[PDB]
Amino acid sequence: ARCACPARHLNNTNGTVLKLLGCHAFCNGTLCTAPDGYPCYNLTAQQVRTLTTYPNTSCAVGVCMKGTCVKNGTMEQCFKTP
Amino acid sequence: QPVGINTSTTCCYRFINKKIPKQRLESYRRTTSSHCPREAVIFKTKLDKEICADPTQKWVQDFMKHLDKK
């Protein structure tokens, strides 16, 4: 699995690690999955629709497990940087 | 004033496992943000494909050292 492509992550104003939006990324013709344990955000469809360059919603932190961003209860002010 | 909102957000979630010979790589080198989950450097193959490399592995440090001195 040639799944070693870089991918855009989301930042936050909380001073914690950048996190993948969900647990999947496209790389060299393959739908790749982040490794189990990897930090992620699990956003609702509505939250993704309005995601922008500053936080405007409380973003659920999660941990990737077999492709699912399993929420852990921590909430962060996440945003995307173009 | 908070900083770190200005960090770049491209990160490597997986690495190339096996060593890639230097003849297959270009002169491209980009260090990812220290805010990324995993410390990584991005190289580019001669087919213009960006690849994630782990700078704790010895061949990666070797290639970066080679890229330094011309």
Author numbering:
A (entry chain A): 22 to 103
B (entry chain B): 1 to 70
Describing publication, verbatim:
Evasins are chemokine-binding proteins from tick saliva, whose application as anti-inflammatory therapeutics will require manipulation of their chemokine target selectivity. Here we describe subclass A3 evasins, which are unique to the tick genus Amblyomma and distinguished from “classical” class A1 evasins by an additional disulfide bond near the chemokine recognition interface. The A3 evasin EVA-AAM1001 (EVA-A) bound to CC chemokines and inhibited their receptor activation. Structures of chemokine-bound EVA-A revealed a deep hydrophobic pocket, unique to A3 evasins, that interacts with the residue immediately following the CC motif of the chemokine.
To achieve this, we mutated residues Tyr44 and Leu39 in the CC + 1 binding pocket to Ala and Pro, respectively; Pro was chosen as it occurs in the corresponding position to Leu39 in several class A3 evasins. We found that the Y44A and L39P mutants exhibited increased affinity to most chemokines with aromatic CC + 1 residues but decreased affinity to most chemokines with aliphatic CC + 1 residues. In the case of L39P, the affinity decreases were only small so this mutant bound to 21 of the 24 available CC chemokines with affinities tighter than 100 nM, compared to 17 chemokines for wild type EVA-A. Consistent with their increased affinity for chemokines with aromatic CC + 1 residues, both the Y44A and L39P mutants exhibited substantial enhancements in their potencies for inhibition of both CCL2 and CCL7. In addition, both variants inhibited the receptor-mediated phosphorylation of ERK by CCL2 as well as by the same eight chemokines as wild type EVA-A. To validate the structural basis of enhanced binding and inhibition of chemokines with aromatic CC + 1 residues, we determined the structures of EVA-A(Y44A) in complex with CCL2 and both mutants in complex with CCL7. Identifying the structural origin of negative energy contributions at the CC + 1 binding pocket enabled us to reprogram EVA-A as a more promiscuous CC chemokine binder.
